[PDB]
Design a protein around this ligand. Structure first.
Ligand code: ATP
Ligand code: ATP
Ligand code: ATP
Ligand code: ATP
Ligand code: ADP
Lengths: 578, 367, 379
């Protein structure tokens, strides 16, 4: 007792314990257990960081304050330091000697309570070249006789996995569940605790700041539990605003600072648009339309979803956007998404649904069940989302995956959460789910038989409905049906590819100019409505790169200069030179 | 009473210690009661309260505030889920029979299978029921359980395997919250082999995880939501007259769920589609939620009545239930609102009025 | 890393659980970030709150060395804890935070360095900086809820191109002193860009610097005839090629000749069907001339025609003439849908998982090769 436990009453007398607020029924039942005749040993079990240790030390704090029923008055709770207890037990019997001496001291006191934090650790305290003769059994007979009182604290998992193993020790304690408090209890706890943090960080918290901290930590941080994550938000806000007086920012911590802390912790695009975040969102449709020609309404839908997200009008809990892009090949379905990722400056999560042809490939997405060979790997999808919570999720050619795999995205779109094999949950509320497919293509490109050609516009939707279950479609933000590229779009695509080729050549230090009629001839040569834009890339490659490759590989353009490409009219041929 | 209740509701210790602990805690409680000198005998009510607090289960509460909570539960839910009253009625009656003590022997509070077209309040009624009771909500998306060997994920890996020390998720959750609402979403999309776990649970209210530990489901409401049988109900027959395909819905459900599984259910509540007035109420609900979102930004909003009617007429889709209304309201309101909140008039200001003209059926905006 | 360093400093000055956790992919610079915080403290490039603070890197080996005689490890650990508590101005840096969840005494196996430290961290008594990769974190560290709760998660993200360029600029003098070689700015930028484009198995601030160091080391092995030189873009290209398997600038050698006479060297082996040799040579030339695709295979060709016309022979001869391996797959063996699992592997939890995929592994082992799909109509 001299130097192995710390007097918690002494701490509360010197203010070393943060004050216990609320927890009325919990502490009342802890006292009730303490007042039993036999096995008066309460065990505080609960989630990690919900106030179990807080309750245990707040009992002694209340004793010092005297706001306790007049049966635990003058009782002194001591926190056991197992670490220092085991320090010098090098020789046989030292541990048992010191432990039993402390035990008989506690027996003689008849007023003290021994609080053992993380009591699940005492299932072994030294069997070094020996048997079960450690503290796990030394403490057993004293509890059953009701001579001493011990308070335990452990999480549900550690309890179930370690403490429940020894039924003899397990039955000597009274399990008490410390549940996570609700909103009002948490904000009141913060109200009672924040004087100390204001003192430590030399700041002031507004009431709205505290309420916002509570609500945001609730709806944005799903890693931890309320009474600790809220005060963590508070502490980090205090520290940040305390580091600001380098420019003499002696002021209160308003709501905006709380949102800064929450966004920097949860890695979310918060803190209201502002600065230029507004400029970037403003001309995003432009920066995309200059790289994706035609199919502008897809860019419109994407930008509207992103703005609604940043404007605070997003969904309560859903991905930023859940889009199904369907249309013929080579019309920019994946390109608009990749360019959106590059424009926003965030991560692109590309997944090739063609690799998920079989039903049993779901385990590749979410991980293998426990006990199996691939358990230690987790799942690819959820791991990627957890690593990059703010990103764009691209699922290429979802019609190629097994029709059953869609049921994962079902829950992902509906709730924005996905649980891997470890019970961990990925947060999809900050991702844009975009799925590309060629579903309605073959049905729209059909030939009517009869004297009257029919309207086949609805056939793309018919095919998509036949492929995707009604509940899967019912969770999509919108289905943007892409149309084929028109000839002016083809000219613009040819120009974009010319710019790409020019960049490639500038890398080699040579310049290229292509006459306008040459561009027109290339467009008229390569245009194929049924195949979109890839034939343009192919024809441009064949017509320009191959002659250019020969010219620069074999001397004529080695460290060359200007490439002179123009079109003649008699043969529709191109010119070349240095 | 101490003996009987410690037997029936404590299953972690052995009888000669269970009863002694019940009696000792009752004595300590009656000894702490006389802070106002109420040194009394231990009545049956005190023993019942002690065991209910030990078993973490609800006691007799026909007088407390939760009696009123149960009194107005059906209405406090009907204000959030419009139509489909029979589901709310069944849920409330099951919760009452459990709380009234006139419950099932050792079964869960209620075992209900919710089936019907998508986009209706099958899962939403469950979320709002968990909120209205203030009890934990355990959500399990059975779509993550397509393979038959994912049962190991539910109940844990057998001893002598890599995933043993983690334990099952379902049993661990129920251990953490013995009084909760258990939501199993899209169970027909899980592997049909998984249904046998639910067989065992529904019949006995108990479940043994990998550690031989038994989870107690007697105080957990079991609600499972499916979209099974919907294809037939909405499938058009060929002929001059269409048939009620509800018989086909029943046939499909029986195809998917073995006879004993259907026998271990409290009821199968067939959710209906949403009517037009129900659509109007849904529009009102979503507009209220949008108004809350805007007030978070400091923007008041007023939407006219005929604008509401026009939104409902534009978004009404019988096949998809209430979900299309979300998109309709989204595009028709949030888009101009997002523009005005980002690079427009509604930056730190509100008073946005939306009204419908009759020449173009368009919306008004602005300060 | 001023943003991340500022986040770390903000975390350290907190009242409770003021223990930042540097989480990031390997090679990103987590250990580098901690030791550079120490370095800037030495140079005073810190806010006054962290000034005059001493960071200690905790060694686990020497801490557990010889800790027989139950209590030796505990006594030693508590002695370290007491020295740090008395210092009141020290931060303990644990390079591998996921490795302190076990400290022997498997009998019982509970009183380890993890449970020994939780009271200190929860009380805000001591400041410790951790570091771990993402998978180690999520599979080893975060499993201990109470320990993960006492640490503040900081994501150390992969830097950008220009950030990498500046990092290499700042690190260059040490590599110069080590190799006695000098780097040109164009060479550094080329190293960064080529490492991004062609090296796929590492992350920027550890693979661009890898190219820099290896170029310096090889140019240090050039003065066997005393070829004293600075590192130009050419050496960088050679280095990045030794991993990408195709040099871009070495084409100024006889590689130009091999390209030029390739069509003929094939025509002497494949008679007729000149169109195929022409197409293949044009594709390979466009690739080697830098005009090829930046994210596509060198060439994707479908050869169709009657039997015995040289469809398979021309590809084998092309592989021979180029000196590259022939990754040969017969699509008649993949006549069934489920056979794709041979090419890509089985999902986790299934019998063939640990084997991997045939095609992907063959490609990874041979980054530069010709892929032949015999009888594709049979798959
Ligand atoms: N009633 C309370 N009053 C004030 N703070 C509380 C209360 N309950 C919890 N806390 C906060 O939680 C922290 C203490 O956590 P607690 O001891 O409850 O969990 P724990 O013992 O750390 O759990 P584990 O052993 O799983 O880590 C304190 O920093 C405090 O801010
Ligand atoms: N609107 C467009 N503007 C510019 N380039 C385009 C456009 N549409 C297609 N492309 C070209 O096509 C390539 C990408 O095509 P994309 O991935 O969009 O096809 P897709 O719609 O996915 O068809 P599939 O799924 O069948 O491949 C780009 O390299 C780009 O040059
Ligand atoms: N009765 C209702 N009242 C109000 N809103 C409803 C109702 N039914 C559904 N909704 C809307 O639908 C959303 C919830 O959908 P839910 O999860 O119930 O779909 P579901 O029944 O699972 O369909 P599926 O299983 O086919 O996906 C809520 O956001 C809510 O706005
Ligand atoms: N901020 C930085 N400035 C310069 N170089 C850095 C920086 N961060 C990392 N590096 C480079 O990375 C190397 C050190 O690796 P670092 O400590 O960053 O990660 P690590 O210790 O390898 O991580 P782990 O411990 O997980 O393996 C150094 O050689 C250095 O060149
Ligand atoms: N055009 C050709 N020139 C020279 N040899 C050829 C030609 N076509 C076929 N052969 C010979 O016939 C054999 C079969 O050629 P291959 O291309 O593999 O046939 P397939 O097209 O059926 O795969 C080869 O070994 C090759 O030597």
């Amino acid at each position: 007792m001299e130097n192995f436990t710390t007097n918690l009453n002494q701490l509360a007398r010197v203010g070393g314990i943060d004050p216990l607020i609320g927890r009325e029924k919990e502490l009342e039942r802890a006292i009730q257990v303490l007042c039993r005749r036999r096995k008066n040993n309460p065990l505080l079990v609960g989630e990690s960081g919900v106030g179990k240790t807080a309750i245990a030390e707040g009992l002694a704090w209340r004793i010092v304050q005297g706001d306790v029923p007049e049966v635990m008055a003058d009782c002194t709770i001591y926190s056991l330091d197992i670490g220092s207890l085991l320090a010098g037990t090098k020789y046989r019997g030292d541990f048992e000697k010191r432990f039993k001496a402390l035990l008989k001291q506690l027996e003689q006191d008849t007023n003290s309570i021994l609080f053992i934090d993380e009591i699940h650790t005492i299932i072994g305290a030294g069997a070094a070249s020996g048997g079960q003769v450690d503290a796990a059994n030394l403490i057993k007979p004293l509890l059953s006789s009701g001579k001493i009182r011990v308070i335990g604290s452990t999480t549900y998992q550690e309890f179930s996995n370690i403490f429940e193993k020894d039924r003899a020790l397990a039955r000597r304690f009274q399990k008490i569940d410390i549940t996570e408090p609700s909103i009002e209890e948490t904000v009141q706890i913060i109200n009672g605790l924040k004087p100390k943090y204001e003192a430590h960080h030399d700041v002031r918290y507004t009431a709205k700041a505290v309420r916002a901290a509570v609500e945001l930590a609730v709806k944005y941080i799903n890693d931890r539990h309320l009474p600790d994550k809220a005060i963590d938000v508070i502490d980090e806000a205090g520290a940040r605003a305390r580091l600001m007086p380098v420019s003499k920012r002696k002021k209160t911590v308003n709501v905006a600072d709380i949102e800064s802390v929450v966004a920097r912790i949860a890695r979310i695009p918060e803190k209201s648009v502002s600065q230029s975040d507004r400029d970037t969102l403003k001309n995003l449709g432009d920066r995309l339309k200059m790289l994706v020609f035609g199919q502008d309404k897809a860019i419109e839908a994407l930008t509207e979803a992103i703005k609604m997200a940043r404007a605070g009008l997003g969904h309560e809990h859903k991905p930023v956007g859940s889009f199904l892009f369907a249309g013929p090949t080579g019309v920019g379905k994946t390109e608009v998404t990749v360019q959106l990722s590059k424009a926003l400056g965030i991560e692109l999560l590309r997944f090739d649904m063609s690799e998920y042809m079989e039903r049993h490939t779901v385990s590749r997405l979410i991980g293998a069940p426990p006990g199996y060979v691939g358990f230690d790997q987790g799942g690819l999808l959820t791991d990627a989302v957890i690593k990059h919570p703010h990103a764009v999720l691209l699922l290429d050619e979802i019609e190629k995956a097994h029709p059953d795999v869609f049921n994962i995205l079902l829950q992902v779109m509906d709730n924005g959460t996905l649980t891997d094999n470890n019970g961990r949950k990925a947060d999809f509320r900050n991702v844009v789910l975009v799925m590309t497919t060629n579903a309605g293509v073959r049905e729209t490109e059909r030939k009517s038989i009869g004297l009257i050609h029919q309207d086949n516009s609805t056939d793309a939707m018919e095919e998509i409905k036949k492929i995707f279950t009604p509940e899967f479609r019912n969770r999509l933000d919108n289905i943007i049906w892409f149309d084929h590229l028109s000839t002016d779009v083809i000219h613009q695509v040819v120009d974009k590819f010319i710019v790409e080729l020019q960049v490639q050549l500038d890398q080699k230090g040579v310049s290229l100019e292509v006459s306008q009629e040459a561009r027109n001839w290339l467009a008229e040569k390569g245009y194929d409505r049924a195949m979109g834009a890839r034939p343009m890339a192919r024809v441009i490659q064949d017509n320009l790169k191959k002659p250019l490759a020969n010219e620069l590989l074999f001397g004529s353009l080695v460290d060359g200069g200007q490439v002179t490409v123009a079109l003649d009219k008699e043969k529709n041929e191109l010119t070349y030179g240095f």
